[PDB]
DNA sequence: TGTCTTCAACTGCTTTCGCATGAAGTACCTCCCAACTACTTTTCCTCACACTTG
DNA sequence: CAAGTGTGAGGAAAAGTAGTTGGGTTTTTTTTGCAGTTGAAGACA
RNA sequence: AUGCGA
């Protein structure tokens, strides 16, 4: 403990306690006896005209009458205050380096897991989807630790997480990429685009030392951007050796035929050309671990080639259907019916993806936006943009002001199921073409192909020419009969 | 100023608040009214201070307390000196100044002595 | 009101930068008329966290 | 400055406003009794300087 | 060289005892603090042109 | 004619810190009564 | 010191 005495103790009895009798004017023994002082000073009368400029003023360097014999204090250096304030304004983050990276690491860790479980709820793909995804990143982590020391090139990127989920899904081979991406954007199924979730509140603050803040969808994918990292992850992963049948899916073909001019025959046509020179009669697999940092026209992005065969098939098939199985007036009817139209969720989604306002292929639909499409758009904004967010501080005043403002314009709401489903729309346009049974048709064919180029290209990293660069590639591949 | 009693109660006040006072640092203060010489009118006064001004001062004198539209006032005194001299009193920067009244007369308007 | 008549009667307070200009000097180095035109009083208001 | 003067009643200016004193101009409304409150606004003072006079005329 | 007379400027006080116990003054000067908007700082992420080959 | 190595810059964002202004304490150093007395202007032998 | 009880 501290001691007593920093003023007085009763030298009579050894009782080191002190009483104050303010009525007496006396400092006395708390336990025992006597007068600790008869003298008592400063409780002035009725005479303080205050002429005294009394410039002095206490400032704790001349001590004090000590009128508390009660004490404990401590040795002081001289006004903690600055050290006190330094300590109050300390708990923040002020980190950086390996430590910051570990939590940057951690946060990345968590959001992916949150991503995966919505994955299960949406797809109901049992322990299986969950555990494969976990070891996939366990494998990813393995590599990160090795080149540690102070290496802080963890790639990841807003893209890396979905590449991870993508590769894991392919191992399992549940779906597709474009479909997955459009679905995800449309329903914000992924926690992908905003990184505020986590349960970081704190990770947010850990002055995620430059790292973390870089979290949060930062932006939407360009041309490559996303197929490139998948390759990096595979090289990171050595994924092809580890997992079976990657990039495959007779389901992407189905998705694609139904996508539009779904021809109860073009599935087998394109499946056949794929059969053909499409990797020698074999389901093309996940490209490799493009180890090199330059990431060139890998192009063996299997799907990228699937869409290419898809397109090719259509015009080849349709611009030498000698037997005339596909009528002149039939081709434009399909492209016809195609013109825009609502979407039991899908087309509305593709509008939401179009609105990344990229290379201006959908920008104008931006403009046009077929009436309601306009309406169900604002509907999806009032539901799925709300998370939007929650000024912290800056007046519990402006927060209030903001609230008031919102209240003011209160916005929202100052046979049913109109937006029919997907296979409903699909049915009704193949019916809209159900009347089935020279220069112009060539033009029509080109017209139609540009459209699909729009569609397939729009879900994906496009390259208003890589696409065709891609196209060009297999064109060349083909003529070695 | 213009609140009806009901509104005044709705504003946490004594339904009859007369006002007229000032809340300064929370303490209600009003300015005490003062009785001063009636403005703008010459009041004939005999005062021994006038003798206290110096030699040749009589008791007699006139005091008019002129107040401007803005209500600031300026007191003007005439003294009859025992010698017949008339002096004009005024105050500026709270200092007193004496001038012969015939000076302020010839100064106000161009005139003859016979005027 | 009384206060605005008062400010109309106080008039001006003139100051010369000390004539300089190098008659420049003697005939003042420009006049610097100053004054108070109007006086307004507003009902008590309080804005917190300052502006905004 | 006017809160100053209104808080002490020491009105000071380079003219003295033509007043014989520089204090006492302001009083606390002292709401201890409604009578007291209304009476302040019907109180009129001859001024402190005559409080200083020794006579009673 | 010696003594006297009147007037004007300066000194000290003119109720006792206590409550509200004292309070906040205010010219002249300013360096520090709180604010709104714009600019700058640190870590991290991703792709391209050229030289040489078939 | 064509496919594959080598490598420096282009790009995005939250939190902190810059420029310009203002607010704002903090900071600091004009007679109104009495009774007595000294020095004066004036006068004398 | 201003107002006030006695």
From Swiss-Prot, chain A:
Residues 67-101 are annotated as: B-linker. Zn(2+) binds at residues 10, 15, 29, 33. GO terms for cellular component: nucleolus; nucleus; RNA polymerase I core factor complex. Its main location: nucleus. The keyword Zinc applies. It is found in: Nucleus, Nucleolus. Although it shares weak sequence similarity with SUA7/TFIIB, displays a similar subdomain organization as SUA7/TFIIB, with a N-terminal zinc finger, a connecting region (composed of B-reader and B-linker regions), followed by 2 cyclin folds. Component of RNA polymerase I core factor complex (CF) that acts as a SUA7/TFIIB-like factor and plays a key role in multiple steps during transcription initiation such as pre-initiation complex (PIC) assembly and postpolymerase recruitment events in polymerase I (Pol I) transcription. Binds rDNA promoters and plays a role in Pol I recruitment. After binding of UAF (upstream activation factor) to an upstream element of the promoter, CF is recruited in a SPT15/TBP-dependent manner to form a pre-initiation complex. This is RNA polymerase I-specific transcription initiation factor RRN7. It comes from Saccharomyces cerevisiae (strain ATCC 204508 / S288c) (Baker's yeast).
UniProtKB/Swiss-Prot annotation, chain B:
Coiled coil: none annotated. It is found in: Nucleus, Nucleolus. The chain holds residues 173 to 287 of 1203 of the full protein. Belongs to the RNA polymerase beta chain family. Component of the RNA polymerase I (Pol I) complex consisting of 14 subunits: RPA135, RPA190, RPC40, RPA14, RPB5, RPO26, RPA43, RPB8, RPA12, RPB10, RPC19, RPC10, RPA49 and RPA34. The complex is composed of a horseshoe-shaped core containing ten subunits (RPA135, RPA190, RPB5, RPO26, RPB8, RPB10, RPC10, RPA12, RPC19 and RPC40) where RPA135 and RPA190 form the DNA-binding cleft. Outside of the core, RPA14 and RPA43 form the stalk that mediates interactions with transcription initiation factors and newly synthesized RNA. It comes from Saccharomyces cerevisiae (strain ATCC 204508 / S288c). This is DNA-directed RNA polymerase I subunit RPA135. Three distinct zinc-containing RNA polymerases are found in eukaryotic nuclei: polymerase I for the ribosomal RNA precursor, polymerase II for the mRNA precursor, and polymerase III for 5S and tRNA genes. Present with 14100 molecules/cell in log phase SD medium. DNA-dependent RNA polymerases catalyze the transcription of DNA into RNA using the four ribonucleoside triphosphates as substrates. Component of RNA polymerase I (Pol I) which synthesizes ribosomal RNA precursors. Besides, RNA polymerase I has intrinsic RNA cleavage activity. RPA190 and RPA135 both contribute to the polymerase catalytic activity and together form the Pol I active center. In addition, subunit RPA12 contributes a catalytic zinc ribbon that is required for RNA cleavage by Pol I.
